[PDB]
Amino acid sequence: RESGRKVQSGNINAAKTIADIIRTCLGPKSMMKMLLDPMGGIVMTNDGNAILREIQVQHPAAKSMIEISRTQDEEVGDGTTSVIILAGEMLSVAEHFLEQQMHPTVVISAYRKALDDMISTLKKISIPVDISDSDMMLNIINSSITTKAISRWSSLACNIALDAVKMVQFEENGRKEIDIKKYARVEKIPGGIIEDSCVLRGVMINKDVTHPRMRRYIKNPRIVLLDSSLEYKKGESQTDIEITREEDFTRILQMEEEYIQQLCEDIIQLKPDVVITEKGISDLAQHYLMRANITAIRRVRKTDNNRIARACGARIVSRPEELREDDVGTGAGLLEIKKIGDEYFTFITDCKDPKACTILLRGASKEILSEVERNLQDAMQVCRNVLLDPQLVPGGGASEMAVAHALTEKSKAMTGVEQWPYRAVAQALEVIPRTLIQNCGASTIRLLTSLRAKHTQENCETWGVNGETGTLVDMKELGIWEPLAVKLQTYKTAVETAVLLLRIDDIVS
Amino acid sequence: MLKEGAKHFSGLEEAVYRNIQACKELAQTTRTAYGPNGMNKMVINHLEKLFVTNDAATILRELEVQHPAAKMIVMASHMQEQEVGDGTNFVLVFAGALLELAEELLRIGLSVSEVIEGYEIACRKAHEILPNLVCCSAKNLRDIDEVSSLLRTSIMSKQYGNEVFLAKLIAQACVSIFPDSGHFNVDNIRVCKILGSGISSSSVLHGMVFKKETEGDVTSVKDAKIAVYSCPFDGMITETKGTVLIKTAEELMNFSKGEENLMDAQVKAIADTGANVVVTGGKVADMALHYANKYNIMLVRLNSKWDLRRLCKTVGATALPRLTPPVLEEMGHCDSVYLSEVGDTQVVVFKHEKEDGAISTIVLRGSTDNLMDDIERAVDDGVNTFKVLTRDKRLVPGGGATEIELAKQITSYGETCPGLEQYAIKKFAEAFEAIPRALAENSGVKANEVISKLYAVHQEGNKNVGLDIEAEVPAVKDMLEAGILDTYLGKYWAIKLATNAAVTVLRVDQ
Amino acid sequence: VEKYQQLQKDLSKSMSGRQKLEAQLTENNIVKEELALLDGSNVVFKLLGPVLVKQELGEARATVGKRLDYITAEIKRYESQLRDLERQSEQQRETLAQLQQE
Amino acid sequence: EVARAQAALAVNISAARGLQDVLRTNLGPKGTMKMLVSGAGDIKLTKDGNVLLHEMQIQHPTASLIAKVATAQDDITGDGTTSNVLIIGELLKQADLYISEGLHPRIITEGFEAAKEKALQFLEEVKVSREMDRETLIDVARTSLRTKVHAELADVLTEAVVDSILAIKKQDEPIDLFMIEIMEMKHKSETDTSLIRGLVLDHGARHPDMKKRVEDAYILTCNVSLEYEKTEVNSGFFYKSAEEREKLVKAERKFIEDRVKKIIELKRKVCGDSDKGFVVINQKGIDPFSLDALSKEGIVALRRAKRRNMERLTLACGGVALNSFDDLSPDCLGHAGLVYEYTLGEEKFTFIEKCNNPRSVTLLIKGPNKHTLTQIKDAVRDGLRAVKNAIDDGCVVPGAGAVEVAMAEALIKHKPSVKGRAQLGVQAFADALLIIPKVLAQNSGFDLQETLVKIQAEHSESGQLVGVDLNTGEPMVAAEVGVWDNYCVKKQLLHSCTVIATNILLVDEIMRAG
Known part of the structure; x- marks a missing residue:
C-alpha cells in the first residue's frame, strides 16, 4: 500500500522523471536515449513509446503514464512522446506549491481553465489547411514524415495516404464522423516499388488473397458480401430433424437446400459473378451460386469483408433472406485479382460509399515497402488530423508562449486562486522552447525572454523558437505546421492525466 | 579493461611483466635440462606416476598455463623436438633470457x-656464421663412431653419464642401415624396454621386439604372415553390440561351448588365412592355444595399442576384434617372425629389414622402467639426431661451445648496425651465455667466470661446459674437439626456432 | 517394443466382458423395468445354465437387483487389473526401448 | 538505477579509449597482433579491430556498438576497422573537452556535419586515381598485410594476393566472391601460399592408382552414395524396437556395387579411353572396390567433398553437381587443363587446375597448422579486401595518415562553417583525423607533433600527401612508400566514423530496463 503526500510527490516524480528524459528525444532535432540491460539489450531511441515499453515502472503513476501514453498512442501513436511531457511538468509545478498550498481540487478545475484557453488560442494560431492542395497537407506531411527522417519514398506514397485516408473519409454520423484514417486499409505487395505503389478505389484486398478465390478480373459483375445467415432452414423459417438414414439424406438435405436456394436466388438476382461470403455459409448457399456459375467465396474474415464492404463500399447484409444489390455489390463495382510480384491480389474497386481508397504499398522487398509505410503511417495519421481539423498551426513555441500569456492574461483577468495554477500551467507551455532550445543547443533564457518578446507584440502567433532552425521563428517562414486536431489532443491528453494522477493519493493492496 | 567489457589476458603488467614471468619461469628448469646433466626433476601424472625427464617436453607437456605465449613457444620446442631432438630444452631456456x-x-x-x-x-x-660455425659433419652412419658422437651430444645434453655406452649401442643399432638418404624408420626401430636385467644389459635387437608373451605353438614359418587383431581371441565373449554391452542376458553363456569349435575354426582360419602369428589383444585361451597348437600359430596373448598400432602400422595390419574365423588383410610385412627370449623374457620378434623399411627394434633392459622411460627420452635424443637427412650433418660444435663464436660477433656486429636496432642485436648475442651459465651453474659456476674465459678463448668453437669439473673452473671442456658436436640443422632450428616465437609473442596485449 | 504392448491384452482381457456387462448393466435396469413391467403376464426366467430355470419375479427381482449389482461387480475386478496392467507396462516402455536402441 | 547527464557519456567515452588504445597498433606496418585465452577462453590469435572485438566477451554496451557499424566497413575494407575505432575516440575526447569546457553535444554533433561533408568534400579532392595495376595491387595488398601481418608476410602474400585477382579482373569483377577459395596446407612453414587457378580438394579419396594425375579432366561431382551409414536407423535414429532398423543396410553396398558398373560405361560413354581422364567426386564416402574398379577404368574419384567445392568445381572446372553414376554426358562433366592428387603431410590433396573456369581459384597456404595458420589466413583475405577497393575505385591514395593533416589543414583554418558553433564540432572533427598516423608513428618512432609538423609543414608546403614512414616514425610521401589507401576505405570511414560517434554523443541517458 502506497499513499499520501508520498504518492502526491509520487504523482510528481513518476510523470516527471518519465517526461524529464523524453523532451530531449522530442523534435526533429532530438537527443537520443541509450538503454542497456543486465540482459545486455541496448536501445538507441528518440521514441518515447519504444522506450515506454522496455522501461520498468515500479509506481502505478509511472505505470498509468504508460496507459495515458498508449491513449495518445491508441489515438495516433505520435504526440504520445509529447503528451507525457505536459502533465509531468504540471504536477512538478503547481502541486508542490499548491498541494502545500493545499488542494487537489483547485488546479483540477484550473486544468480545464487551462484546457479552454489553449482552445481559445487555438482558434487563433491554428489556421485552416485545405485537403484540396496536396502540399498544403503534404508540407505538414513532409514535416510529419521527416520526423522519423525518411523523406525518400515515404513522401510520394504519403500522397497515397493524402489520398487513401482522405478518400476513405466518409460516414457522416450527422456530427460528421467522416474525418478518419482507419478506413484506409494498407495493401501488402511483394515486388513492385513505392513508385508504382498507388491507390486503387475502395479497399485493395491483400489479406485473405494469396491466390484468386474471386474469379480473376471482374468489372461489372457484382462483388457480393454474404454475411452469416446462409445456413439452412429445413422448415419454412424453421429447422426440423436432420439427415439420419436413407431418405433423410434426400428429404432433409433437400429441406436444407430449398431455403438456401431461396437465399441463393436473391444473390444471383442482383447479377454477381464473384460472391464473397464470410462465415455462416452453406455449401447449399454456394452450389446454386455454382448453378448460376457465380463464385461464392466462403469463410473469409470480417474486417476483410468490411474492407470489401469498403472495397466496393457495399454494406454487410443485415437480412440475408431478403437481399438487394443496394445491400451488396453496390454501384457497378470492380473485382480484380492481380499477381504483383508473388501474390494474386484481389482489387475490389470502383467503390460506392464516398469513393474509398487504400494505400497500395509496393516494395521491392517488404523492407523498402515497410520503411515507407511507417512514415506513411505518420501522414495517414496526420491526414486524418488534417481531415479532423484542417487547421495547420505554427509549430515550436508559437502556441506555447501564446497560451501562456493568454493564461496569465487570464490570471491577470480572473485574478483568483487559479491565476496561480495558470502561471503554473502557463509555465508548462514553455516546454517546446526549452525542448527545442535543448535540441538546438542554445541559451533558453534569452530565447525565453525573446519569445515573450515574440509574444509581446506578435503574440507568438506564428513565432516560436524552432530548435531545428535553432532560432525564434515564424513558422510560416519555416512552413512548420500541425492541425489544431493534433495540438489540442496532445494538449488535452496530459491535462487529463495531470488531473488523473493528482486525483490519486492512495494505493491499497 | 577500463570497462564492463573486453575480456583480456595480456597488456601492461601481463604483457610487459607477466609474459616474461612464464618466459623465465618455464625457462628455469630448462636451464638444468639441456647440456650435460643428470638433473633430477620429478614429474608424476594425474595418475601421480613417478617420473623424471631431462627433456623439456615431458616437463612442458606435463604443465598447465594460462599464458598462451608460454603455451605457444613449446610448439617451437615441439617444432624442435618434432624436426629435431636434444636441444629442445635449449629452445625455451634461450628465449627466456633473451626476452x-x-x-x-x-x-x-x-x-x-x-x-x-x-x-x-x-x-x-x-644463421650467417652458423654455417661458418659448421666444423665437421657426420661422415658415416656406417661409422659407429660418427653415430656414437651423434648420439653422444644427444644423450649427453640430456644425460651425460650414460652417454657414450648408449651412444655406442644405438649407433650399433645399425640404424645406419637406414641411409638417412630420406628414409629412416623412427617408430619401426623404436625401443622396447625390458624391465629386468641391466640397463647395461640394455642392447639393440633387429626386427621388431614385442616383449608381450608368445602364445600358441610358435609361428609355423618365419616370414609368418601376421594376423594382428584387437580381440581375435578375447575369448568367444561377444564383440557384437553397438555399445559393446548386454542386449539380453543369455548371450555370454554360449561362448563357453562352441568356444572350442570357434577357437578351432577361428585359429584354423588363422591357419587358413596364412597367418602363422595371430596377435590377440584379447586374452589367450587354451582352446585357441590348443588349436593354435594344432595349427601351430603363435598367439600374441595381449596387446598394448603400441603393440597393435605398430603391428597395424609396420605389418600393414588392421587390429580387429574377432570371434568368427578371421582373414588376412594384414598378412605379414615381416620376413622373419620369431618368438625369442630376450631380456630372458619371451619376446615376440617380428623381422623384415631393408635399407628403406627395416625394423631394428632396440631392446632396452633394466631393473626399472622408470629408468628406461627417461633413458628412452635420453636415447630418443640421438634417434632424432639420426634423422637430419643430410648424412653429413654439417656438425657445428655442440654443447653451446660455438655460441661465443656467434655471441662475440653478432654483439660486436651489434654495435656495427645502429640504433634501437643495434641493442636487440647486441641483446640477441647476449643470450648465448645463458645455456653455458645455466649448465655451468648446473656444475655451479657463474657465466662471468666461465664466459669471460669463453670471451678470453675467443674463436674456438671448442670451449663450453656444464657438467664436469672442467665445467667448474676452466670454462674449457671440448663441446667441439672432444667428440661433442651438433648438426647445422638442429643448431639451425636451435637458433631458428628460438628466434621465431620470442619475437612473435612480443606483440600480444591480449 | 513388446514392453509397450505387453500388459495391454491382459488389461483389455478383464475389460472385455466388463464392457459387455455395461450393456447388460443397462439392460439390468431394463429387466428391472421388464420385471416390474411383468406382473406375471408372461413368464419370467433367469436363463442360467443350459437348463431353462422356471423363475419368478421375486426370484428374479433380488436377482436382477443382484445381477445389476454383480454386473457392476465385474467392473471392479478389471478396475483391479486396470491399474495393474496399464501401470507396469508404463514402466516397461522405457526398459527395452533404449536397450534395443543401445 | 540510471546514468544520466554527463554519466551517460563519460563511461561510454572512457571505455572508448583503452579499447582504442590496445589496438592503436593493430594497424599499419606498426600493427601488433593480440591473442585471447580470455574472451572465448580458447587459444586464439588475431589481428584486426572488428575481429578482436567479437572474439572478446564485451559487457560494456558501447564496445558491442561499434562492432556492428565497424563490421559494415570491415566487410569491404578488412583494415581500417582498427583504424576507425581510433579516430572516433580521438573525436569523442574533443567533444568531451567541449562539454568539459561545457557546451551542448547536439550543437556539437551539429558541428561535425559540415566538417564531415567538408572532409568528404575534401575526400574527393584528396582521392588521386591510381588505376588497377599490380603495383597499386601490390602496394595496397602489402600495406593492408603490412597492417595485418609482417611486411615480410605482406610481400610473401602480395604475390598470392595479386595471383587470384588477375582472374577476377578476367571476371571483370570488382569484388572477389570466388578465387577466395583458400586451402590451408599441413606443413611446418607458414609462408607458402600456392596459387592454383583451379581448386584443391584434400581428396583423391581413399584409393591410389586411380590415375591421380588427370590431364583430360572429366569431373562427376556427386552426392550419390558409393558409401554410407552403417549406423542403426529406422526413423533416422535408434528406434525403440531393435529389428526394423536392420532391413535398410543390405541395399547399401549392392547399390554401391551397381554404381561401379554404372561408372564403367560412364567411363566408356564419357571416354571409352583411360587416356581421356575421368574424375568422380563424391560428397559422401566411396567404397574401396568402387574406387578400385574406378581405378580400373582410368578414373580418379574423390569421396566426401564439400558444397562450395562441388559448386566451385561445378564452376571452376565447368563441373557438375550431377546426381548419378549412370552413363552421363562428358560435356556435362566438367574439365580442367590439369588435375593432380598432391600430398604434403598425411592427406593427399587433389590439385585441380587450369579448370574451365579460372573462377574459384585456390590460394593454398601452408602453415604450422595452428591458430597461427589460422592467423596467416585471415589477413591475406583482407589484403584482397584492401585491393578490391583499389579495384573498386580508380582513386588509390597514399596511406599512413597522409590524408589526415591536409584535412585539418583544409578544414579548420578557414572555418568550414565560417561559423564557430559548428566549428566547435569541426575543431573536434578535424582532430579525430590525426591520431592513427601520429599514434602509430610515435608508437613506431618519433612523436605525434614533431612528426606532425614534418608531415604538416610538407603538407603546409605542398598540400601533397606526405604520409608517415612507419619504418621510422617520421613522415614521408606515402605515394613512394607504397602504403596506399583507396578512396573507398577513406570514403567509408567517415560514414562509419561520424554516424556512430554522433548518436552516442547524443545519448541523453542510459538505463538498465526491462
Whole structure:
C-alpha cells in the first residue's frame, strides 16, 4: 500500500522523471536515449513509446503514464512522446506549491481553465489547411514524415495516404464522423516499388488473397458480401430433424437446400459473378451460386469483408433472406485479382460509399515497402488530423508562449486562486522552447525572454523558437505546421492525466 | 579493461611483466635440462606416476598455463623436438633470457618493432656464421663412431653419464642401415624396454621386439604372415553390440561351448588365412592355444595399442576384434617372425629389414622402467639426431661451445648496425651465455667466470661446459674437439626456432 | 517394443466382458423395468445354465437387483487389473526401448 | 538505477579509449597482433579491430556498438576497422573537452556535419586515381598485410594476393566472391601460399592408382552414395524396437556395387579411353572396390567433398553437381587443363587446375597448422579486401595518415562553417583525423607533433600527401612508400566514423530496463 503526500510527490516524480528524459528525444532535432540491460539489450531511441515499453515502472503513476501514453498512442501513436511531457511538468509545478498550498481540487478545475484557453488560442494560431492542395497537407506531411527522417519514398506514397485516408473519409454520423484514417486499409505487395505503389478505389484486398478465390478480373459483375445467415432452414423459417438414414439424406438435405436456394436466388438476382461470403455459409448457399456459375467465396474474415464492404463500399447484409444489390455489390463495382510480384491480389474497386481508397504499398522487398509505410503511417495519421481539423498551426513555441500569456492574461483577468495554477500551467507551455532550445543547443533564457518578446507584440502567433532552425521563428517562414486536431489532443491528453494522477493519493493492496 | 567489457589476458603488467614471468619461469628448469646433466626433476601424472625427464617436453607437456605465449613457444620446442631432438630444452631456456633483455630494453623503453628486428637480422646474422660455425659433419652412419658422437651430444645434453655406452649401442643399432638418404624408420626401430636385467644389459635387437608373451605353438614359418587383431581371441565373449554391452542376458553363456569349435575354426582360419602369428589383444585361451597348437600359430596373448598400432602400422595390419574365423588383410610385412627370449623374457620378434623399411627394434633392459622411460627420452635424443637427412650433418660444435663464436660477433656486429636496432642485436648475442651459465651453474659456476674465459678463448668453437669439473673452473671442456658436436640443422632450428616465437609473442596485449 | 504392448491384452482381457456387462448393466435396469413391467403376464426366467430355470419375479427381482449389482461387480475386478496392467507396462516402455536402441 | 547527464557519456567515452588504445597498433606496418585465452577462453590469435572485438566477451554496451557499424566497413575494407575505432575516440575526447569546457553535444554533433561533408568534400579532392595495376595491387595488398601481418608476410602474400585477382579482373569483377577459395596446407612453414587457378580438394579419396594425375579432366561431382551409414536407423535414429532398423543396410553396398558398373560405361560413354581422364567426386564416402574398379577404368574419384567445392568445381572446372553414376554426358562433366592428387603431410590433396573456369581459384597456404595458420589466413583475405577497393575505385591514395593533416589543414583554418558553433564540432572533427598516423608513428618512432609538423609543414608546403614512414616514425610521401589507401576505405570511414560517434554523443541517458 502506497499513499499520501508520498504518492502526491509520487504523482510528481513518476510523470516527471518519465517526461524529464523524453523532451530531449522530442523534435526533429532530438537527443537520443541509450538503454542497456543486465540482459545486455541496448536501445538507441528518440521514441518515447519504444522506450515506454522496455522501461520498468515500479509506481502505478509511472505505470498509468504508460496507459495515458498508449491513449495518445491508441489515438495516433505520435504526440504520445509529447503528451507525457505536459502533465509531468504540471504536477512538478503547481502541486508542490499548491498541494502545500493545499488542494487537489483547485488546479483540477484550473486544468480545464487551462484546457479552454489553449482552445481559445487555438482558434487563433491554428489556421485552416485545405485537403484540396496536396502540399498544403503534404508540407505538414513532409514535416510529419521527416520526423522519423525518411523523406525518400515515404513522401510520394504519403500522397497515397493524402489520398487513401482522405478518400476513405466518409460516414457522416450527422456530427460528421467522416474525418478518419482507419478506413484506409494498407495493401501488402511483394515486388513492385513505392513508385508504382498507388491507390486503387475502395479497399485493395491483400489479406485473405494469396491466390484468386474471386474469379480473376471482374468489372461489372457484382462483388457480393454474404454475411452469416446462409445456413439452412429445413422448415419454412424453421429447422426440423436432420439427415439420419436413407431418405433423410434426400428429404432433409433437400429441406436444407430449398431455403438456401431461396437465399441463393436473391444473390444471383442482383447479377454477381464473384460472391464473397464470410462465415455462416452453406455449401447449399454456394452450389446454386455454382448453378448460376457465380463464385461464392466462403469463410473469409470480417474486417476483410468490411474492407470489401469498403472495397466496393457495399454494406454487410443485415437480412440475408431478403437481399438487394443496394445491400451488396453496390454501384457497378470492380473485382480484380492481380499477381504483383508473388501474390494474386484481389482489387475490389470502383467503390460506392464516398469513393474509398487504400494505400497500395509496393516494395521491392517488404523492407523498402515497410520503411515507407511507417512514415506513411505518420501522414495517414496526420491526414486524418488534417481531415479532423484542417487547421495547420505554427509549430515550436508559437502556441506555447501564446497560451501562456493568454493564461496569465487570464490570471491577470480572473485574478483568483487559479491565476496561480495558470502561471503554473502557463509555465508548462514553455516546454517546446526549452525542448527545442535543448535540441538546438542554445541559451533558453534569452530565447525565453525573446519569445515573450515574440509574444509581446506578435503574440507568438506564428513565432516560436524552432530548435531545428535553432532560432525564434515564424513558422510560416519555416512552413512548420500541425492541425489544431493534433495540438489540442496532445494538449488535452496530459491535462487529463495531470488531473488523473493528482486525483490519486492512495494505493491499497 | 577500463570497462564492463573486453575480456583480456595480456597488456601492461601481463604483457610487459607477466609474459616474461612464464618466459623465465618455464625457462628455469630448462636451464638444468639441456647440456650435460643428470638433473633430477620429478614429474608424476594425474595418475601421480613417478617420473623424471631431462627433456623439456615431458616437463612442458606435463604443465598447465594460462599464458598462451608460454603455451605457444613449446610448439617451437615441439617444432624442435618434432624436426629435431636434444636441444629442445635449449629452445625455451634461450628465449627466456633473451626476452628479459627486451623488457629491459623496455626498461630502456625501446620500441617493439625496433627490438623485433634486432633479434632477427642478427638471427640471420647468427644463421650467417652458423654455417661458418659448421666444423665437421657426420661422415658415416656406417661409422659407429660418427653415430656414437651423434648420439653422444644427444644423450649427453640430456644425460651425460650414460652417454657414450648408449651412444655406442644405438649407433650399433645399425640404424645406419637406414641411409638417412630420406628414409629412416623412427617408430619401426623404436625401443622396447625390458624391465629386468641391466640397463647395461640394455642392447639393440633387429626386427621388431614385442616383449608381450608368445602364445600358441610358435609361428609355423618365419616370414609368418601376421594376423594382428584387437580381440581375435578375447575369448568367444561377444564383440557384437553397438555399445559393446548386454542386449539380453543369455548371450555370454554360449561362448563357453562352441568356444572350442570357434577357437578351432577361428585359429584354423588363422591357419587358413596364412597367418602363422595371430596377435590377440584379447586374452589367450587354451582352446585357441590348443588349436593354435594344432595349427601351430603363435598367439600374441595381449596387446598394448603400441603393440597393435605398430603391428597395424609396420605389418600393414588392421587390429580387429574377432570371434568368427578371421582373414588376412594384414598378412605379414615381416620376413622373419620369431618368438625369442630376450631380456630372458619371451619376446615376440617380428623381422623384415631393408635399407628403406627395416625394423631394428632396440631392446632396452633394466631393473626399472622408470629408468628406461627417461633413458628412452635420453636415447630418443640421438634417434632424432639420426634423422637430419643430410648424412653429413654439417656438425657445428655442440654443447653451446660455438655460441661465443656467434655471441662475440653478432654483439660486436651489434654495435656495427645502429640504433634501437643495434641493442636487440647486441641483446640477441647476449643470450648465448645463458645455456653455458645455466649448465655451468648446473656444475655451479657463474657465466662471468666461465664466459669471460669463453670471451678470453675467443674463436674456438671448442670451449663450453656444464657438467664436469672442467665445467667448474676452466670454462674449457671440448663441446667441439672432444667428440661433442651438433648438426647445422638442429643448431639451425636451435637458433631458428628460438628466434621465431620470442619475437612473435612480443606483440600480444591480449 | 513388446514392453509397450505387453500388459495391454491382459488389461483389455478383464475389460472385455466388463464392457459387455455395461450393456447388460443397462439392460439390468431394463429387466428391472421388464420385471416390474411383468406382473406375471408372461413368464419370467433367469436363463442360467443350459437348463431353462422356471423363475419368478421375486426370484428374479433380488436377482436382477443382484445381477445389476454383480454386473457392476465385474467392473471392479478389471478396475483391479486396470491399474495393474496399464501401470507396469508404463514402466516397461522405457526398459527395452533404449536397450534395443543401445 | 540510471546514468544520466554527463554519466551517460563519460563511461561510454572512457571505455572508448583503452579499447582504442590496445589496438592503436593493430594497424599499419606498426600493427601488433593480440591473442585471447580470455574472451572465448580458447587459444586464439588475431589481428584486426572488428575481429578482436567479437572474439572478446564485451559487457560494456558501447564496445558491442561499434562492432556492428565497424563490421559494415570491415566487410569491404578488412583494415581500417582498427583504424576507425581510433579516430572516433580521438573525436569523442574533443567533444568531451567541449562539454568539459561545457557546451551542448547536439550543437556539437551539429558541428561535425559540415566538417564531415567538408572532409568528404575534401575526400574527393584528396582521392588521386591510381588505376588497377599490380603495383597499386601490390602496394595496397602489402600495406593492408603490412597492417595485418609482417611486411615480410605482406610481400610473401602480395604475390598470392595479386595471383587470384588477375582472374577476377578476367571476371571483370570488382569484388572477389570466388578465387577466395583458400586451402590451408599441413606443413611446418607458414609462408607458402600456392596459387592454383583451379581448386584443391584434400581428396583423391581413399584409393591410389586411380590415375591421380588427370590431364583430360572429366569431373562427376556427386552426392550419390558409393558409401554410407552403417549406423542403426529406422526413423533416422535408434528406434525403440531393435529389428526394423536392420532391413535398410543390405541395399547399401549392392547399390554401391551397381554404381561401379554404372561408372564403367560412364567411363566408356564419357571416354571409352583411360587416356581421356575421368574424375568422380563424391560428397559422401566411396567404397574401396568402387574406387578400385574406378581405378580400373582410368578414373580418379574423390569421396566426401564439400558444397562450395562441388559448386566451385561445378564452376571452376565447368563441373557438375550431377546426381548419378549412370552413363552421363562428358560435356556435362566438367574439365580442367590439369588435375593432380598432391600430398604434403598425411592427406593427399587433389590439385585441380587450369579448370574451365579460372573462377574459384585456390590460394593454398601452408602453415604450422595452428591458430597461427589460422592467423596467416585471415589477413591475406583482407589484403584482397584492401585491393578490391583499389579495384573498386580508380582513386588509390597514399596511406599512413597522409590524408589526415591536409584535412585539418583544409578544414579548420578557414572555418568550414565560417561559423564557430559548428566549428566547435569541426575543431573536434578535424582532430579525430590525426591520431592513427601520429599514434602509430610515435608508437613506431618519433612523436605525434614533431612528426606532425614534418608531415604538416610538407603538407603546409605542398598540400601533397606526405604520409608517415612507419619504418621510422617520421613522415614521408606515402605515394613512394607504397602504403596506399583507396578512396573507398577513406570514403567509408567517415560514414562509419561520424554516424556512430554522433548518436552516442547524443545519448541523453542510459538505463538498465526491462
